[PDB]
Paper text:
Mechanosensitive channels respond to mechanical forces exerted on the cell membrane and play vital roles in regulating the chemical equilibrium within cells and their environment. The MscS-like channels are homoheptamers, with each monomer comprising a cytoplasmic domain and a transmembrane (TM) domain. YnaI is paralogous to MscS with a similar architecture. YnaI’s most distinct feature is that its transmembrane domain contains five TMs instead of three for MscS.
Here we report the cryo-EM structures of the SMA2000-purified wild-type YnaI at an overall resolution of 2.4 Å. Consistent with the previously reported structures, 3D reconstruction of YnaI directly extracted from the cell membrane with SMA2000 reveals a heptamer. We could reconstruct the soluble portion for YnaI at high resolution; however, we could only resolve TM5 and TM4 of its transmembrane region. EM density for seven potential lipid molecules was found in the hydrophobic pockets defined by TMs 4–5 and the cytoplasmic region. In the E. coli inner cell membrane, phosphatidylethanolamine (PE) is the predominant lipid species, and this molecule also fits well into those densities. Therefore, we tentatively built PE molecules into the corresponding densities. Overall, YnaI appears in a closed state defined by the minimal diameter of the pore formed by TM5a ~13 Å, similar to the closed state of YnaI in DIBMA (14 Å). The lipid observed is bound in the juxtamembrane area defined by two TM5b helices and a loop from the β-domain, which forms a protein-lipid interface. The negatively charged phosphate head fits well within the positively charged pocket formed by R116, S119, R120, K123, Y174, W201, and R202. In our structure of YnaI solubilized in SMA2000, TM4 (MscS TM2) is shifted by about ~15° or ~2.8 Å compared to the other published structures.
Author numbering:
A (entry chain B), B (entry chain A), C (entry chain G), D (entry chain F), E (entry chain E), F (entry chain D), ...: 111 to 339
Amino acid sequence: DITSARIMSRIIKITIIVVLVLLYGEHFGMSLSGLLTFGGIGGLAVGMAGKDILSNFFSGIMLYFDRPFSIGDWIRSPDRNIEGTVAEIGWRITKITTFDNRPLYVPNSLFSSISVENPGRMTNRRITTTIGLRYEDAAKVGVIVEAVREMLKNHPAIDQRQTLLVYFNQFADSSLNIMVYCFTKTTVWAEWLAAQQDVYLKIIDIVQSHGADFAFPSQTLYMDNITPP
Amino acid sequence: DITSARIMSRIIKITIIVVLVLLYGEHFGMSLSGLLTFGGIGGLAVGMAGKDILSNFFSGIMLYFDRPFSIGDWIRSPDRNIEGTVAEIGWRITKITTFDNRPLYVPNSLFSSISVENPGRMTNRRITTTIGLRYEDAAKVGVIVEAVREMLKNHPAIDQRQTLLVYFNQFADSSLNIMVYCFTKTTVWAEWLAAQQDVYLKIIDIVQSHGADFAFPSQTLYMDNITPP
Amino acid sequence: DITSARIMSRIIKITIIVVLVLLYGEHFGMSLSGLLTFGGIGGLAVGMAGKDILSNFFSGIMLYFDRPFSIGDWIRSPDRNIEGTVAEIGWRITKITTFDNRPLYVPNSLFSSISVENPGRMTNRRITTTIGLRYEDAAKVGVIVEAVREMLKNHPAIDQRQTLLVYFNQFADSSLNIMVYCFTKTTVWAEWLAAQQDVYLKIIDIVQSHGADFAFPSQTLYMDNITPP
Amino acid sequence: DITSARIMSRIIKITIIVVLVLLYGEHFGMSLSGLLTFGGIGGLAVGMAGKDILSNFFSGIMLYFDRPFSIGDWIRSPDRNIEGTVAEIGWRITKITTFDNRPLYVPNSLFSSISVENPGRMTNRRITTTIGLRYEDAAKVGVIVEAVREMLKNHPAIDQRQTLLVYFNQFADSSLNIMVYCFTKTTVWAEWLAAQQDVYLKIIDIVQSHGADFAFPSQTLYMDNITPP
Amino acid sequence: DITSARIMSRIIKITIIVVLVLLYGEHFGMSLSGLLTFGGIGGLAVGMAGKDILSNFFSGIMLYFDRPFSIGDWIRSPDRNIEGTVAEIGWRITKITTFDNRPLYVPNSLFSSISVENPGRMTNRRITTTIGLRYEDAAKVGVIVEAVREMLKNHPAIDQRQTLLVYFNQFADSSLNIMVYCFTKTTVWAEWLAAQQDVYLKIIDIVQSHGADFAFPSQTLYMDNITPP
Amino acid sequence: DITSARIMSRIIKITIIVVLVLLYGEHFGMSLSGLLTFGGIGGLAVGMAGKDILSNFFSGIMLYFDRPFSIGDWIRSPDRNIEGTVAEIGWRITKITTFDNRPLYVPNSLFSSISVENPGRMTNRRITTTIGLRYEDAAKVGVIVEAVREMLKNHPAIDQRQTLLVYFNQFADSSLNIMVYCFTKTTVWAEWLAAQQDVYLKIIDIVQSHGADFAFPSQTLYMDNITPP
Amino acid sequence: DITSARIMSRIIKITIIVVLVLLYGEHFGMSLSGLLTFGGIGGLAVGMAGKDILSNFFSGIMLYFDRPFSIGDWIRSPDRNIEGTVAEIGWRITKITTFDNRPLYVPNSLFSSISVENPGRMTNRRITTTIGLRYEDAAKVGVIVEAVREMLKNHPAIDQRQTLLVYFNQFADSSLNIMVYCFTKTTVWAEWLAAQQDVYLKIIDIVQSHGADFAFPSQTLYMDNITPP
């Protein structure tokens, strides 16, 4: 915009006139010590006010040098909400496309103090879940675990080079949970979901094939009758 | 107001007199070192007190240069509550109209340290939901998922170029949740709500038609009946 | 309070003597460097201690120039608890009358770093609610929605130029919720409450006129009697 | 502790001798630059370390100048827990008598950055509550409201010049809550509680006069049986 | 420990050699400006690093001069967890014996920025509780309140000069709570507990003397029978 | 690898060359004033960057002088998670052994701003618990309290010189809780647990000896039947 | 993209010409005081902006000297979420592989202010669990505890040199909890899980061998009837 050009011209004019008066003040402007003090105060205020912008620019330069992410991939941070697919990497501001298709303008300085996670560069997608048996299938926990583990071992979509754990490890207050923890070969978010659904259906079939069943949030009641007779 | 102009003139006169005494102090005011100390202390205090206003002004300039938002679109921030429609962008503060029609005055400096989202520039509005089947019907999960996916694919208000996912991926503590995740073509908040309602009614029809039902928060009770005989 | 004056005079005298010794002590007081460093340290410590007090005054000046609120208006902030109707705006601290009829003295500095919302300046009061049908009456949602909408279209206390939405958009845990979102023409907190009550009663009448009903929080019990035979 | 009085004397002696050496160092001590930098570093360390005391003293002076509270009245802050009755106001700390009859020593600096509320200076006490009818009483809500309102218009202990609101505005999860919001004309904490109790008893009587019968959580049990034959 | 003395001697040697080189550098070395900047940077870094340690000592001096707590009384802070009995007060570290007989070493600096409560110096112990009647005995509230108030007024362990409030002021969701708020004469934690137990037993007797038994978390079931025919 | 000593030597060489150029710039380096500000800015940046590292070493020195803990002691802090058994105390980093036998490397600076508790030096271990009767055995509260108190007083593993409290002081939501609060003579975590188990079993025996019987959550229901006829 | 090298060379040129002009300005650029002011302002602003980047590099150097972790080791921090396996330690950024196989980029400065835990250097894995007996079978707690202790003492996968605790210590609101606390010899996350599953199954067998079942979330329901006849 032409008005933006006008604003830049005004800013550079103010800066350059300040520089000239400070640099050539001693020649004409008396009290070089007074000019020293005034310029020091002004510069200190300006810098301690614009430190945010300067940090943004320097963080942008750093991001450009070392690349925690590229345009295509999507990022997230446990410390702060910046999740989304990066659209543009600017000097001061980076635009990220959220998963609801909304722009998100992240100052670059934010990346100098938080740990940035890059799921776009991940190698595998993880499937984690719990079974949660019924406290009366305790005699069947071992066979259920073995069957689930064998099913996961022969699943085409499961990566056999990664960790594949199926173990009764929780012992919750209303169920005997069995952790299932594996990885898929694909990282597409549609093949992964299909594989997860298939694994879950196979798990249901395995659990119900034996005499076991999943548990609801059970209770005991100790019912008492106090209604008038 | 007259008093506002009076206050501005008083501030200007104070600035002028301090500038004059600092610049011409050496000529008449002795103690060049003492004048240095006094002026430096005063300037440091003033600047370290007004850094907030200076930051507001600089952030306003930056907002003018980089344009996260216009004067018509609505914005929000995950970090802080600034949600609303931008009413006007000032040099020091931005006036935003909240969705309950209340003015909100946001200092510009906060825009230099938070990530600003701009839903006003969004491309599509997303419909996300969960089914949560009655959990005693797991043999009907696949057919229900397929029917819902086909219904969404054939829906005229759903954008077919965006992600369209319908998958069982949960094992909820009381239900078999099926995530549904799609996008609409419109972004008007009135056609989007109508499309969402239509999709939800279609989903209800699909679920009921397949001999399934939505789940409530179930539990088991193990009745004891300790009432006195 | 003669002491108010005594302490002010004492502070003025201390400041004056410090200024005299720092400014006219260059010749009588030897060690220009020593007095320079002494005065610098003292002034720096005083400034770092009084930065908050100076910030209060500067923020008061800014509030006087830029006016987020006036005496009559009642304000609030998402970031801090300053809710109430402002009683007066001092240079250093503003006192606000809370809705308990209690005075609350808020320093001006806080207004330089928080978003100040001014509900006193609003144009409309918003009515928002949800219906939450039993989920056994999903066939009556649509009709009911329309009915409610029509009622809000004909209500004399509802502003027709503002947002007016009535839609099923939830799939709640135990009910089918219908968001109602409208604005009233008045902003007086007494006609608004009366209009809200009238709208709610009309909504009850509309819901019960059909075969629908509002839902309680339900769960499926599944009892397995284990009392001794 | 005579030794600590000697320690105080030693502290003041150290301060005075350091000042004298800094001011008389040049005459005997040499390397004006070295002495200057040593004094500067020492002063910077002392100022950065011993700043809380100066801030507390300045905040105490300010508290004396502008009086957010006096000795008798009790104060509270939404930001920090300082609730209690002011026992005495010192230069660095204030003693506040909590409602446990325990002394609480609040540094003065805290008062320079938090909003201080003075309930001791309030003009009225507020009675606020909700009714919460059964949800089978909708047809009787209106009259109920009116009745309650009338009971508050004729109550000797209710201030008629303040806001007096009685309205159905909630649509709660298990009840039809009616907000009651009024003010008493006493502020002594014993007649206020008595008036509140009287108003609550009158509200109970009014509600029972009609078939209203304040509600309970009221969940639907959606019962099923799986006990083996 | 001899090595502690060795470390102290090493620190003293480093300090003295630094002082000698910086203060007599010009007479022996050269580069007044270079030595000045080097010494300044070094001293500034050391001060920024040791500000916390210096603050500890300054806060210890203040804690001696102003005495929030003595050598035997127990303290606590709503801001920080420092609860316990003061074991000893050092120049930098204060040792407090927690109530589980475990030492706690708190830096003195913390006491300069938090409000310290000293229940060791309190005058009375407070008894506060709620009754919570069955909510079907509202006609008994007045007589029960009067009886409890008379019992408290006639109790020999209750301080009659302090506040003594017994009032129905709640409208809980499942009961009619009655606040009881009084003080005891003793403050020794063993007779206070005995008096509290006696008051509680007397309250139980008073409540059950009238047909106004206490309240449990009531509910309203609304059963739907869905068992297969 | 050699890279450690190589990097140390490189850092030493860089520091030495910087010192030489800055301190001999006076002789050959032109613009004696320019190099002064260059070195000043460089040193300010380096110190402001390494303040944390310097503070770590200073806090290590302080920890070596003042001894909150020794090698064998296991420590914990309410402010931050550092719980574990000290493994070694370094100059910058302290190595702690967690109770899950994992190393934990705590920067020494952490200990300069948090209160460190040292359970390793406890004198006694504490047993605290509550009984929780049923509201129907309120007539037995006194007798049970006396019996438990006598049992604790006669127990051989309980320290009689410490506080020994057994009192009804709660009025729980669904029970009459009796607080029990005593100390054991041992502090070894194995005899303490055995003594606690023995005390708990004796408490169960005492409670069952009378008809108290250890209340449950114990709510009320008020059944309403809406089942279709 | 050679533009990266071009921008790096531009930065080098800027930072070298600044040094050239500042160090040679005194020869040709007048106003030594003004030039010093400008240079100091620029350096101070750049330092405040790049302190974070400088701290990252210094923390990287220290992390190389002191080694909290190595490449293969997997680390975590109670303060920040940095959990994962270290991929590579850089000068400014450390790359860590999370357990969901995605990279995480942690600035080195984070390691200078948080305590880093290294379960990679862990020696033994811990098995900790709770039993929670039926809470009406307290007479069997001792026998169950002894049996479980013997089972753990005779288990070949349990380290007998570590702590091995099995004790009743809780009085849960619905159960009598037995804490079990032991260590396993292996640390491979696969034999540990197998050993934990075996121990849990043996615990179930022991608990059910002599009649004592696990507790559910019990209640005392107190049914009351208010349905119309």
